[PDB]
Design an enzyme around this catalytic site. Structure first.
Site, mmCIF file in Angstrom:
data_model
loop_
_atom_site.group_PDB
_atom_site.id
_atom_site.type_symbol
_atom_site.label_atom_id
_atom_site.label_comp_id
_atom_site.label_asym_id
_atom_site.label_seq_id
_atom_site.Cartn_x
_atom_site.Cartn_y
_atom_site.Cartn_z
ATOM 1 N N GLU A 69 -3.613 13.275 2.850
ATOM 2 C CA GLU A 69 -4.739 12.758 3.637
ATOM 3 C C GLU A 69 -5.389 13.907 4.401
ATOM 4 O OE1 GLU A 69 -3.214 9.336 5.755
ATOM 5 O OE2 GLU A 69 -4.390 8.048 4.369
ATOM 6 N N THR A 91 -5.428 3.282 7.444
ATOM 7 C CA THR A 91 -5.735 2.042 6.726
ATOM 8 C C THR A 91 -6.289 1.096 7.760
ATOM 9 O OG1 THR A 91 -3.554 0.890 7.109
ATOM 10 C CG2 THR A 91 -3.805 2.321 5.136
ATOM 11 N N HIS A 143 0.811 -1.194 0.000
ATOM 12 C CA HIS A 143 0.000 0.000 0.000
ATOM 13 C C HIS A 143 0.881 1.297 0.000
ATOM 14 C CE1 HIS A 143 -0.071 1.005 4.526
ATOM 15 N NE2 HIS A 143 -0.130 -0.381 4.665
HETATM 16 O O1 LIG Z 1 -2.038 5.361 9.057
HETATM 17 C C1 LIG Z 1 -1.468 4.876 8.018
HETATM 18 O O2 LIG Z 1 -0.742 5.487 7.182
HETATM 19 C C2 LIG Z 1 -1.700 3.411 7.814
HETATM 20 C C3 LIG Z 1 -0.835 2.575 8.763
HETATM 21 C C4 LIG Z 1 -1.034 1.239 8.766
HETATM 22 C C5 LIG Z 1 -0.285 0.406 9.573
HETATM 23 C C6 LIG Z 1 0.671 0.932 10.386
HETATM 24 C C7 LIG Z 1 0.916 2.284 10.278
HETATM 25 N N1 LIG Z 1 1.793 2.787 11.095
HETATM 26 O O3 LIG Z 1 1.458 3.978 11.461
HETATM 27 O O4 LIG Z 1 2.873 1.894 11.467
HETATM 28 C C8 LIG Z 1 0.186 3.128 9.491
HETATM 29 NI NI NI Z 2 -0.013 7.396 7.103
#
Ligand SMILES: O=C(O)Cc1cccc([N+](=O)[O-])c1
Ligand code: NI
Ligand code: NI
Length: 257
Positions: free
Chosen positions: A103, A196, A61
Site C-alpha cells: 500500500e 478500507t 478482504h
Molecule cells: O487499514 C486496513 O488495512 C483496513 C482495516 C479495516 C478494518 C480494520 C482495520 N484495522 O486496522 O483493525 C484495518
Molecule cells: Ni492494512
C-alpha cells in the site's frame, strides 16, 4: 458491497464513504528525499513478550491474526506516540504478482506485500472507541520483498488452507509476532487513515524502512486465499491494496538521517 475490482474497488469507495477524498487518507507514497529527519521523535518501543495470539480469520478482504487485547500484553509506545497502544491484530496486503502488493510506496517502488500490526490507544478503552479519534490507532507497517524465506512467517502460511474462504477462522495460539520484524526499527511516520471502508482518519502510521524478506513460496500461499465464501465462485484474494492517495497538507517525518 465493496471490494478491489473494477466495479467495486478503490476508485468507487467515495460514494459510500466521502472521507475517501479527505485530508489524511492512506496509504501514501513516501518520498525519501523530502521526508524530514525529526529529532523530536522519542525512541520506538515494541513490547511483544507477553503477546497472546488467539485466532486467524479470513474476513473476506484479508486474513487477520487476532490477539488478546484485554490487557497490556503486546504494546507499542514511543516514536511519535503519546501514551500506550495495544496490539489487536495483524494483517497483510499483497499482490497478484511480486511486482505489486504494498500500500505504501517508497519513491514510487511497490513491494510484494505489506504487514500491518494494528494497535489502539488505551486511553480510549477499546478499539471501537479508538477508531473514532484522530490519535486512536497506531499501525506499524513492514514491507515484504521476495527473496529468502521468513522463518517466523511459516506458521501463518501453513494454516491458510484452513481459512481459504470468507468467514472461516481457526485457532492460532502461541504465535510470536516478533518473528516478523526486521532488524532495524528506523521508520517514517505521518497521520493517516484506515485503507478500507470506513476509511476512518484515526491512524498514526509508522512505516519501517527495512523490509523483511519472504520466499516466493510463502507469498504464493497468500494468493491461494479466496475473497468469496465457500460454495460461491472462486475469486482469488489478490491485489487487496489501496493505491497511494494524495499527501495534501501532510509532512512525512523520518526517525533516522
Ligand atoms: O487499514 C486496513 O488495512 C483496513 C482495516 C479495516 C478494518 C480494520 C482495520 N484495522 O486496522 O483493525 C484495518
Ligand atoms: Ni492494512
Ligand atoms: Ni458492501
Amino acid at each position: 458491497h465493496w471490494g478491489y475490482g473494477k466495479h467495486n474497488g478503490p476508485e468507487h469507495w467515495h460514494k459510500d464513504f466521502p472521507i475517501a477524498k479527505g485530508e489524511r487518507q492512506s496509504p501514501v507514497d513516501i518520498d525519501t528525499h523530502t521526508a524530514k529527519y525529526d529529532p523530536s521523535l522519542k525512541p520506538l518501543s515494541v513490547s511483544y513478550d507477553q503477546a497472546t495470539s488467539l485466532r486467524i480469520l479470513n474476513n473476506g478482504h484479508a486474513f487477520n491474526v487476532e490477539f488478546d487485547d484485554s490487557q497490556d500484553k503486546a504494546v507499542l509506545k514511543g516514536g511519535p506516540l503519546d501514551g500506550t497502544y495495544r496490539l489487536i491484530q495483524f494483517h497483510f496486503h499483497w499482490g497478484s504478482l511480486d511486482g505489486q502488493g504494498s500500500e505504501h510506496t517508497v519513491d514510487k517502488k511497490k513491494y510484494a506485500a505489506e504487514l500491518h500490526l494494528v494497535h489502539w490507544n488505551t486511553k480510549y478503552g477499546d478499539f471501537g472507541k479508538a477508531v473514532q479519534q484522530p490519535d486512536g490507532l497506531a499501525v506499524l507497517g513492514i514491507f515484504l520483498k521476495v527473496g529468502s524465506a521468513k522463518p517466523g512467517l511459516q506458521k501463518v502460511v501453513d494454516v491458510l488452507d484452513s481459512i481459504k474462504t470468507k468467514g472461516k477462522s481457526a485457532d492460532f495460539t502461541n504465535f510470536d509476532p516478533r518473528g516478523l520484524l526486521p532488524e532495524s526499527l528506523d521508520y517514517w511516520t505521518y497521520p493517516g487513515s484506515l485503507t478500507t471502508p470506513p476509511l476512518l482518519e484515526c491512524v498514526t502510521w509508522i512505516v519501517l524502512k527495512e523490509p523483511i524478506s519472504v520466499s516466493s513460496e510463502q507469498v504464493l500461499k497468500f494468493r491461494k486465499l479466496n475473497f468469496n465464501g465457500e460454495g460461491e465462485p472462486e475469486e482469488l484474494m489478490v491485489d487487496n491494496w489501496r493505491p497511494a492517495q494524495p499527501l495534501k497538507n501532510r509532512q512525512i517525518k523520518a526517525s533516522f538521517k
